[PDB]
Design a protein around this ligand. Structure first.
Ligand SMILES: Nc1ncnc2c1ncn2[C@@H]1O[C@H](COP(=O)(O)OP(=O)(O)O)[C@@H](O)[C@H]1O
Lengths: 600, 459, 57, 180, 600
């Protein structure tokens, strides 16, 4: 129960009378109850790395012994909540303390125990029914958007002996009671899970469904899959805000978990100011994405343990909402800062410095964290299937992808959306460079595309090859100029420009292409590639004649068609329904076919 | 057999990193095994890394997190780590600690084999000379494997080393113009990699003869130190006692080496280059040198470790020591992969130490060595010509340089490049090599003796 | 649509083979179980306590 | 994926869940075909086995413990239960329920099935209407959704009924359409 | 008598009750009696590096104290045998145990005591004759290649009281009884010598005769003398093991001891498979070279602490056979593995490391081991002249020659055959880097060259000049190109390419290039240098004239002669006689002369 502080040197506190303590357990040191992690044991002397500043912690101070490791506290109240990396509810600490600082050793519960929740038990469950870990034994109306399914913890099972009637309950109320081998377990609406322990699932299915974002470049050229693993460069003008906002507002992800993991103070202030104001249209009503989002936000002056465990807290919350049956999108703002916190912990423990000073396990930690992303058959009786898509961003030193953190992240992840400050300056938004980006889920999504969007795969391959050919010809243009380019080279260049400026380029502020449905995206790409193929066919088949066609001839004859191709962006998905947009694109293709037939 | 009851100690003196430390141990045995029941009933395993008087440092395989000092009870098996081995292990899936994860029963042991094995009497060791027809042109033609050889696949993150290994598995057979049991250990491999290998072995009808030891990324780190040894003990039983021909595939030897470095750092052992323990060479040797044929026994163990070179650095300690130990290396090239050449094998840094005896007259064909050497020389000169051309441009290249560049293009397009399911015979690979060499006049092929050139060149 | 037929035949044949194997194993175990049990119980009953070889005086 | 203890606990829980789904869908024991198919798992629920005893049976193999097969069968039952529940006021004939059960069982993969997608859409509409306040849009949605539930009960979801497809399309479009 | 194991940290055991155990004394640890050597001695406890794996060794296990240092049995039966690190005959172990492994603690005799050797005493020796250390008092007909001289052990002396008559005697039968100061010493045909003490020799004469390897580059550009010290640094795959084996097969050393210290076991198996087939003609009769080769194999996975014992056993055997009058050649397969073993034992001992973790005494140990090489005036009464040429491969980690082991070895060895990974990758074997490599015996071998191959020293000097000039011209060309090259510079480049591709590099696995006699090594160089002289003379003397002769003209006119020079390496020393090869080279020289005359 109670230890005592036998010594204090920096953040390391050696506690006596700690015979029963467990390795990597959590302890409240001092009279202010500073959080601390047992990092060593020697007889009764347990060494503790104290998260908060140890100034004023005097010998003889009691050391309360929490019977758990660093464990997130799951249950209603997560949604719309701003936590620290340690699950400290900043938004509740500020309200209760009426201060701009975080009091040393603040012990505010992660989830409010006073707020009441409308809880409806599973109708089938009774007294005596067999229940198993992962079973949804109730549903709580947390929001008009997210129904929080209260479910049994893993490692728990038995026969229900009391299930509460529908009503208003708090996180401290006992909503269920079960028995196994005579041992009786009373379960409230809140459970606790170690952050560093993977939440079990009945099976980890392959990722076979897109994580649509609405950005044409991301959805079409470089698709990510629900349960995917993605990386994003972190720079000043890169534009990661567009990716975060798209995933938060328009993506099919049922839940969003944004982990700052040690950002600058003002950067985190910007995130905390912007995310609450973002709104999404669900069921015709403009709700707030914070009805379904949670923010594990912490700055660079927070406890290093909090910064290093922010990623684990975020992934554990994402896994919880996945098991609930949802599709969650976790977004680490900069895993580089988490890796810096990890290196700092290694230095504090005086562990051997591995490659470029990072710990001897950086790759293992990153791989194990990214392994928690995926699509699973959620554990429990109600057949569910959730997912956790990690979009953790990394910060390459000066644009170099060779540092240990970026190298490990690129090796582990399967998508890299490669935002570019160069394109940001050129005003090509989104700034995805579409040359260093990549996606390894194309072979996984082949089945989905063939079922729903049959032609999209050849369209995307042709677009990618067009862009590659344009990149290769960019050098030839310098050597011999544009006048020396063949007609096929000219058509490739002038459709590559069309794709760059009119397909990849997309403005998130306009009401018509802030969110681009995949049907619209594939329609635009199909029209562009049809133009390219038919122009190339005309050029090749008139190369043999004296009246050979040229790109100049085609442009002069069909300036209207090129204008319409450029204006395909301006079709509003909302006002111009799917049927209307598809019909208009089909009419456009008819016009192109008529014009090309007349010209040829 | 041990009949005395085994002692259970609650005397856990201290815990630090992955090293429990027990006191009042009665005659501790080094390398002994211990079973730790934690306070919450969780049963972990560990190995006595050191003994001193009544103290015993117990490296726990699952990590020391949650270990208590007064309540954890560690019972001492009285014996070093022994795997239960039976032929029925073929066609099963085990985790990194040899415990089944395919919902089958535990292994009804035919024998209990020490996990570390024994070094084979060099006087009784046979030298591999039976060339394996992997079907890969880059391997058969220029890095020919021999049955009973340690030839790791050096690669990098994201490259098709898994695809190359699976292809070797599914089209590896003797050049006699019988099946290869496969023992596949995987250390810290993502679920996608594990599923790829399992699904390929299932798509082919080889899941009867394949035994999988799996230790994914989320699984315990220390257990990777024993996964290769479990796999190689099973392979040794199947080869030297059951007379099978066992292809052992140890995936992510980089993960194994990093786990070893973690344990060495916890022990504060002497570090080598880039922090790896000073004995990493000896440990990787204990892993790799459990290969090759043996006198009087018709079995063999062929090892193809797949290791990821950090930052594509062939001089990184892991690949460097692995090359020092093993009998070659197949170098998967990022440049070729980016150019979309499959398999992206760079023969220049690749090597096979037993090709010299596995090729020639009798086995395969008699122009094999000369063709391979000439292809190496011409490929190297083509690369040098490319390097000089980057500086001096096209117009400054002589006709010989143009010949070499054409050879390089056609060699990377017709010899290295190959279908993922295309199984070229050694003779087909040599014919491709000859049609490539015929680009040059006879006088430009200085490696091949005139006797060989006269017979083979004209056709 | 027509490829689904062979699954039932394959399942029936392999189930018959598995039944044959299980019956064979059961017969062999019944044949040679009593002596195994007697030897196991005799060896369990035989104790022969002894100290560690490393013990002295 | 799952330790042995947790796997057998999952088996026990899935047997219990199948029993509960059967009790909910057919409290009157009228779905004889479905109950006969699920007999091997419903035998452990008919009698009063305790969790410990049923877990021991699952470990011994006496009770069905192939968790993948149990999951497939439980999903086949649960999709039927969802279909019956989404049209709660409008009951479905026993013949139609049995035919739909057979179709779901025959289906290769329910979690990617058109039946599953249609049920998801109908549940979207029903969940919205369960709490939406009375307005023009909500009254329209309730009317169209009630007609859709009647059509589903009289026909079912295992076909290409043009009327049901039109009702789904229009209802979802109106639901997505802005309130104003 | 008996200590008791106290702890086990790996190869390093700790043993109590060893009050009087001497440093570097031999003890037997455990019940299996694993051999071990004391390395430190604190209080009444000692610490022992165990030469066999210590797994399963428990505290309290007996530790017998053999009051002797690590020593080797020297006598008949060494030639043709493959011992382990501590001199146990592996063939005898295999025959005795009928298993494919090496049992831990096997105590088989080093030299078989059952074989009846044919022993002939020295005719002059009689009862009452004064005999001393190193005195050859017998000859044993070990095999056709080796007349094993039976010599008094060093540190032995006295008046002979019984000399055995000629006949068949086993290694255990007493062969010579002598007395000194009254005390009588009996001597069989086997003498035990501590391996860490240098066997005395009357004098260490200067090395003045080549160690003719089979490699052209080593023989010509970087000669090694009988009694010299050589290092072969190189990355994995460069070919140092193949160089060692080629020297082991084809060289003028009457005895060759391969040490395989920490390298592959397949290599030792290959040695045993090949050497019995290889033969050397003695007095017109072909006799296998395994009759003189003695292997000391300790593969990489065999106990780490045994590598030092392996090196010391190999050097002691080489010294023993040197003392007979033979020019032994000790191939240390990898001294880097010995250095690594020292590093491991030091780490277990918690010693303070030197550069890169190696112990502070690594350089001293390497110097002491190499200092046992020089040609000597063997001890004893019959004047003789032995030698021990230590050819020691080095294995720098990462191919970096700055490695402490490589640096310390270059600080001792007199010949440095550095190998190049780029050349090895190009398959330019032997991969010796002609630039960095060197030999400090050239001035000591010019005496022999001027009398046996009088026309070779100027050829060697000119070849080295050509190679250096080509190196400079290549450094220039890499940045500027060959456009501005002077014609003589072009000729230097082309002749240097010829020398590289067709003189230096030598395929060691062919019937023609496996061994290159020195008449070939000098004839090829003579022809190439003569062609160089003729081309340079032509161009220089025709630079002024109008008919400017250039390299292009020379190459076009002499495409056949250039190809003949290239194919000079293909001459077979065995299939084609020495007379035929010399005649063909003379004919090629005549062709060169006639072609140049007709050209000018
Ligand atoms: N003299 C030679 N002739 C032909 N090939 C050689 C020669 N020396 C080395 N090689 C090649 O170099 C490779 C490595 O040889 P080895 O020396 O055993 O490796 P290491 O340098 O690691 O000891 C061999 O596979 C062999 O083909």
């Amino acid at each position: 129960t109670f230890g005592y502080v036998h010594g204090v040197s920096g953040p390391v506190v050696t506690a006596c009378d700690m015979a029963g303590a467990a390795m990597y357990e959590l302890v409240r040191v001092g009279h202010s109850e500073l959080v601390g992690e047992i990092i060593r044991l020697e007889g009764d002397m347990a060494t503790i790395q104290v998260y908060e500043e140890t100034s004023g912690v005097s010998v003889g101070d009691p050391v309360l012994r929490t019977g758990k490791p660093l464990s997130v506290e799951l249950g209603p109240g997560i949604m719309g909540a701003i936590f620290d990396g340690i699950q400290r509810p900043l938004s509740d600490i500020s309200s209760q303390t009426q201060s701009i600082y975080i009091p040393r050793g603040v012990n505010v519960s992660a989830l409010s125990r006073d707020i009441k929740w409308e809880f409806i038990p599973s109708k089938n469950l009774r007294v005596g029914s067999h229940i198993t870990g992962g079973d949804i034994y109730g549903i709580v109306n947390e929001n008009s958007l997210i129904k929080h399914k209260i479910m049994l913890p893993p490692r728990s099972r038995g026969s229900v002996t009391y299930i509460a009637p529908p009503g208003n309950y708090d996180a401290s109320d006992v909503v269920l009671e079960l028995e196994f081998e005579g041992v009786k377990e009373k379960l409230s609406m809140v459970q606790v899970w170690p952050v560093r322990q993977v939440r079990p699932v009945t099976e980890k299915l392959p990722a076979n469904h897109p994580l649509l974002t609405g950005q044409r470049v991301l959805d079409a050229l470089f698709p990510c899959v629900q349960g995917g693993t993605t990386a994003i460069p972190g720079a000043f003008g890169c534009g990661k805000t567009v990716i975060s906002q798209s995933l938060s507002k328009y993506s099919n992800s049922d839940v969003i978990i944004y982990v700052g993991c040690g950002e600058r103070g003002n950067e985190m202030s910007e995130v905390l100011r912007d995310f609450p104001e973002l709104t999404m249209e669900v069921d015709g009503k403009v709700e707030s994405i914070m009805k379904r989002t949670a923010l594990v936000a912490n700055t660079s002056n927070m406890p290093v343990a909090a910064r290093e465990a922010s990623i684990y807290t975020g992934i554990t919350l994402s896994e919880y909402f996945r098991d609930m049956g949802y599709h969650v999108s976790m977004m680490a703002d900069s895993t580089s800062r988490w890796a810096e916190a990890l290196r700092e912990i290694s230095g504090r423990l005086a562990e051997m410095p591995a490659d470029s000073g990072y710990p001897a396990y950086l790759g293992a930690r990153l791989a194990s964290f990214y392994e928690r992303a995926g699509r699973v058959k959620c554990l429990g009786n109600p057949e569910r299937e959730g997912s956790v898509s990690i979009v953790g961003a990394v910060s390459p030193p000066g644009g170099d992808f060779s540092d240990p953190v970026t190298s490990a992240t690129l090796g582990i992840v399967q998508v890299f959306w490669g935002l570019d400050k160069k394109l940001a300056q050129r005003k090509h938004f989104p700034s995805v460079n579409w040359l260093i980006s990549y996606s390894k889920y194309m072979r996984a999504l082949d089945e989905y595309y063939d079922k729903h969007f049959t032609e999209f795969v050849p369209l995307r391959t042709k677009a990618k090859e067009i862009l590659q050919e344009e990149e290769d010809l960019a050098e030839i243009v310098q050597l011999v100029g544009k006048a020396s380019l063949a007609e096929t080279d000219k058509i490739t260049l002038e459709v590559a420009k069309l794709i760059k400026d009119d397909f990849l380029q997309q403005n998130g502020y306009t009401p018509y292409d802030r969110f681009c449905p995949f049907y619209k995206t594939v329609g635009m790409l199909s029209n562009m590639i049809s133009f390219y193929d038919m122009a190339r066919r005309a050029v090749e088949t008139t190369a043999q004649s004296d009246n050979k066609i040229t790109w100049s001839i085609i442009r002069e004859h069909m300036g209207e068609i090129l204008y319409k191709l450029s204006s395909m962006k301006f079709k509003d998905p909302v006002k111009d329904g799917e049927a209307k947009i598809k019909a208009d694109y089909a009419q456009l293709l008819e016009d192109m076919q008529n014009a090309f037939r007349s010209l040829e | 057999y041990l009949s005395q009851p085994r002692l259970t100690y609650k005397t856990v003196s201290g815990v630090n990193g992955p090293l429990v430390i027990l006191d009042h141990v009665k005659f501790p045995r080094y390398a002994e095994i211990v079973h730790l029941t934690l306070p919450d009933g969780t049963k972990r395993s560990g190995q006595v890394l050191e003994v001193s008087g009544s103290k015993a440092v117990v490296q726990v395989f699952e990590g020391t997190s949650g270990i208590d000092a007064k309540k954890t009870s560690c019972e001492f098996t009285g014996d070093i780590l022994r795997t239960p081995v039976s032929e029925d292990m073929l066609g099963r899936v085990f985790n990194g600690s040899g415990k089944p994860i395919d919902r089958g029963p535990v292994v009804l042991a035919e024998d209990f084999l020490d996990i570390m094995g024994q070094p084979i009497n060099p006087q009784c060791r046979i030298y591999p000379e039976e060339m394996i027809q992997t079907g890969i042109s880059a391997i058969d033609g220029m890095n020919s494997i021999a049955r009973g050889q340690k030839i790791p696949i050096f690669s990098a993150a994201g490259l098709p080393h898994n695809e190359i290994a699976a292809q070797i598995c599914r089209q590896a057979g003797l050049v006699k113009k019988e099946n290869f049991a496969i023992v596949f250990a995987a250390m810290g491999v993502n679920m996608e990699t594990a599923r790829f290998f399992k699904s390929d072995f299932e798509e082919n009808g080889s899941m009867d003869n394949v035994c999988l030891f799996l230790n994914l990324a989320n699984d315990p780190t220390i257990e990777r130190i024993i996964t290769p040894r479990l796999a190689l003990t099973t392979a040794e039983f199947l080869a030297y006692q059951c007379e099978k021909h066992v292809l052992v595939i140890l995936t992510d030897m980089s993960s194994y080496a990093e786990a070893l470095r973690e344990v060495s750092a916890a022990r504060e052992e002497v570090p080598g280059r880039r922090g790896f323990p000073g004995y990493m060479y000896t440990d990787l040797a204990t892993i790799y040198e459990r290969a090759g044929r043996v006198e009087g026994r018709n079995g063999s163990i062929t090892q193809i470790p797949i290791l990821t070179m950090p930052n594509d650095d062939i001089t990184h300690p892991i690949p460097d020591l692995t090359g020092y130990i093993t009998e070659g290396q197949i170098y998967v090239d990022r440049q070729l992969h980016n150019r979309q050449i499959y398999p992206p094998i760079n023969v220049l840094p690749s090597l096979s130490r037993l090709m010299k005896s596995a090729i020639g007259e009798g086995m395969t064909r008699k122009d094999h060595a000369d063709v391979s050497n000439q292809l190496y020389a011409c490929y190297a000169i083509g690369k040098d010509v490319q390097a000089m051309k980057a500086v001096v441009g096209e117009e400054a290249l002589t006709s010989d340089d143009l010949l070499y560049l054409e050879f390089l293009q056609k060699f990377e397009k017709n010899f290295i490049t190959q279908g993922p399911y295309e199984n070229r015979t050694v003779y087909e690979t040599l014919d491709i090599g000859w049609q490539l060499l015929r680009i040059f006049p006879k006088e430009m092929l200085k490696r091949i003796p005139q006797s060989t050139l006269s017979e083979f060149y004209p056709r | 649509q027509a490829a689904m037929g062979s699954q039932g035949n394959l399942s029936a044949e392999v189930e018959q083979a598995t039944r044959r194997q299980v019956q064979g194993m059961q017969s062999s175990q019944q044949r040679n179980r009593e002596r195994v049990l007697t030897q196991l119980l005799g060896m369990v009953c035989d104790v022969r306590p002894q100290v560690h070889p490393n013990y002295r005086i | 994926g799952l330790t042995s203890e947790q796997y057998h606990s999952q088996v026990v829980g899935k047997i219990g869940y199948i029993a509960r789904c059967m009790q909910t869908i057919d409290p009157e024991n009228n779905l004889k075909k479905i109950r006969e198919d699920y007999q091997d798992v419903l035998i452990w629920a008919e009698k009063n086995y305790r969790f410990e005893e049923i877990l021991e049976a699952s470990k011994s193999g006496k009770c069905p413990n192939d968790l993948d097969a149990l999951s497939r069968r439980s999903l086949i039952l649960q999709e039927l239960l969802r279909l019956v529940s989404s049209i709660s006021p409008f009951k479905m004939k026993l013949d139609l329920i049995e035919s739909q059960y057979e179709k779901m069982k025959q289906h290769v993969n329910l979690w990617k099935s058109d039946y599953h997608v249609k049920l998801n859409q109908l549940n979207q509409l029903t969940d919205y209407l369960k709490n939406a306040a009375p307005t023009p849009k909500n009254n329209f949605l309730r009317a169209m959704t009630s007609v859709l539930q009647m059509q589903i009960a009289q026909y079912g979801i295992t076909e290409d009924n043009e009327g049901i497809n039109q009702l789904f399309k229009l209802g979802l479009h109106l639901l997505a359409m802005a309130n104003e």
